[PDB]
């Protein structure tokens, strides 16, 4: 069973289904506003890490309404990306954001220099900054995200 990464379907998200593969896997960040919208809500990515001999296959899911009919699917969730919006969590396993963020890894992507939203500062989520001009730090930000995800995976004793 491949792990699941949940993305925010909001249009203001810096990470969307159009550019999630090229960002998380290839390490290059492209502006999702200019990229065309992706019709498919399920995507597969490959992560290469020094902690594991073999590459890990992960599934990226945008909407959990049609893909989380079983409760055992929530056991595969290793990362959650949110835009600081309460309405993201209406149909989630834990409808309150707080308990969800203590029980799951929360990530918020913002441009460098922008102010953090009030709800984000009141939640237990990581903050990752992407520079508007310089593009060499995208690999570093992706490495921080994958370091957190791999720490969670090793703590969960996942077998691959």
């Amino acid at each position: 069973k491949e792990p699941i990464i949940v993305l925010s379907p909001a249009a203001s998200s810096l990470v969307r289904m159009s550019n999630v593969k090229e960002f998380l896997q290839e390490g290059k960040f492209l502006d999702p506003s200019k990229e065309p919208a992706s019709s498919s809500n399920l995507l597969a990515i490959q992560r290469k890490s020094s902690r594991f001999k073999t590459p890990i296959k992960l599934l990226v899911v945008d909407n959990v309404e049609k893909l989380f009919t079983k409760s055992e699917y929530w056991d595969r969730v290793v990362a959650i990306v949110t835009t600081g919006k309460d309405w993201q969590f209406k149909n989630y396993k834990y409808k309150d954001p707080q308990i969800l963020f203590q029980k799951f890894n929360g990530f918020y992507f913002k441009y460098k220099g922008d102010a953090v939203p009030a709800s984000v500062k009141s939640w237990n989520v990581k903050v990752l900054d992407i520079d508007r001009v310089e593009r060499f730090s995208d690999r570093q930000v992706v490495e921080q995200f994958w370091d957190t995800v791999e720490n969670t995976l090793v703590a969960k004793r996942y077998k691959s």
């Binding site: 390490g27 310089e134 593009r135 060499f136 730090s137 690999r139 570093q140 490495e143």
Partner: peptide, 10 residues
């Protein structure tokens, strides 16, 4: 490779 490119850009 990634570390080298990061060092050059930095």
């Amino acid at each position: 490779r990634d570390a080298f490119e990061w060092v050059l850009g930095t």
